[PDB]
Amino acid sequence: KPTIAAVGGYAMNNGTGTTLYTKAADTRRSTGSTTKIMTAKVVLAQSNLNLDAKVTIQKAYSDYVVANNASQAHLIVGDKVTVRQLLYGLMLPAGCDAAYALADKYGSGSTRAARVKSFIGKMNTAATNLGLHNTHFDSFDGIGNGANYSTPRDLTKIASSAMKNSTFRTVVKTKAYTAKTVTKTGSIRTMDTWKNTNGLLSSYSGAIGVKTGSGPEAKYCLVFAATRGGKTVIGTVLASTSIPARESDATKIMNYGFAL
């Protein structure tokens, strides 16, 4: 068994559900941005899901990332961005503005505030449907909250569930994506290229997911997945000490998991 800096860790064979590694796997901790995995999952499971549907970037999304010093996809106010593009903006450059956009889009309600509340409700309903007992969401992006938490095991189960969707799989294994959006005047804008924050995609052979996360309370987190020898290991590390540390943690856990 490898030693990891993360205070929370879990990994399983995604195909069989068999546990490969544990470290306070059922201890509740802050998720940081890894909560976005649930946002993606809820969006992709919407009955009225239309990946080509366009969303107008609201001033609110921009003001939000600023007010919360949140990571962003740099979506431009006024631009018309598709749900697909938003999913890439959400999962690759850790776009909290993209997360807000998706929550506003798929939440039910007559105001942004109402739809955001509704969307977070759908996230919690999703957790409940998965049979989770140690996860609660109070945000669509993991932005600060004692009421926003999960566990290495719960997050891994959420990720596994999300990975059942081919679109989610395609998005999370994408290293780079350049969104061509539609401006206020109708022209096509080539946004600056988005790079997946998940360094494993290039450093770990066979890596296929899933999503990074960070926060003042959550520290450095990472939900990871990889396939080697026809075996897929999926797991989560919570509260590692740094970005390099969380990547080594994940690399060690997967290596261990494939050697078991």
Give dist(CA 101, CA 77) in Å, integer: 11
42-47: long-range contacts, CB 8 A cutoff, minimum separation 24: 42/106, 42/119, 42/122, 42/123, 42/126, 43/83, 43/87, 43/102, 43/105, 43/106, 44/87, 44/162, 44/165, 44/167, 44/168, 45/126, 45/165, 46/106
- The tokens for 145 are 């909250």
121: exposed, middle or buried (C-beta count within 10 Å: 0-12, 13-18, 19+)?
middle
Task: Give the ranges where 107-242 is alpha helix by DSSP (H).
Answer: 112-129, 152-162, 166-172, 200-203
- The tokens for 172 are 């999370």
Q: Looking at this protein, which amino acid is placed at residue 59?
A: K
Give dist(CA 250, CA 34) in Å, integer: 14
CATH of 1-260, one of 3.40.309.10, 3.50.50.100, 1.10.510.10, 3.40.710.10: 3.40.710.10
H helix or E strand, kind and range, residue 187: none
Give dist(CA 260, CA 258) in Å, integer: 6
Tokens 């749900």: give the residue. Answer: 83
Residues 70 and 96: beta-carbon distance below 8 Å: yes
Answer whether the bond into residue 210 is a cis peptide, omega within 30°: yes
Three-state SS for 139?
coil
Annotated resolution, angstroms: 1.5
Q: Which residues contact 196 (CB under 8 A, 6 or more apart)?
A: 91, 92, 93, 172, 174, 175, 176
Residues 112 and 58: beta-carbon distance below 8 Å: yes
Residues 178 and 195: beta-carbon distance below 8 Å: no
Tokens 């018309």: give the residue. Answer: 80
Buried/exposed 145-171: b ≥16 CB within 10 Å, e otherwise:
beebbbbbbbbbbbbbbbbeeebbbeb
What residue segments make up the domains of the chain, in order of their start?
1-260
171: closest CA among 122, 210, 134, 113? 210
User: What's the Cα-to-Cα distance from 157 to each of 17, 69, 70, 94, 206, rounded to whole Å?
Assistant: 9, 29, 26, 20, 20
User: What's the Cα-to-Cα distance from 185 to each of 20, 80, 182, rounded to whole Å?
Assistant: 53, 10, 8
Give dist(CA 34, CA 155) in Å, integer: 8
32: closest CA among 187, 257, 239, 205? 239
Give dist(CA 251, CA 116) in Å, integer: 35
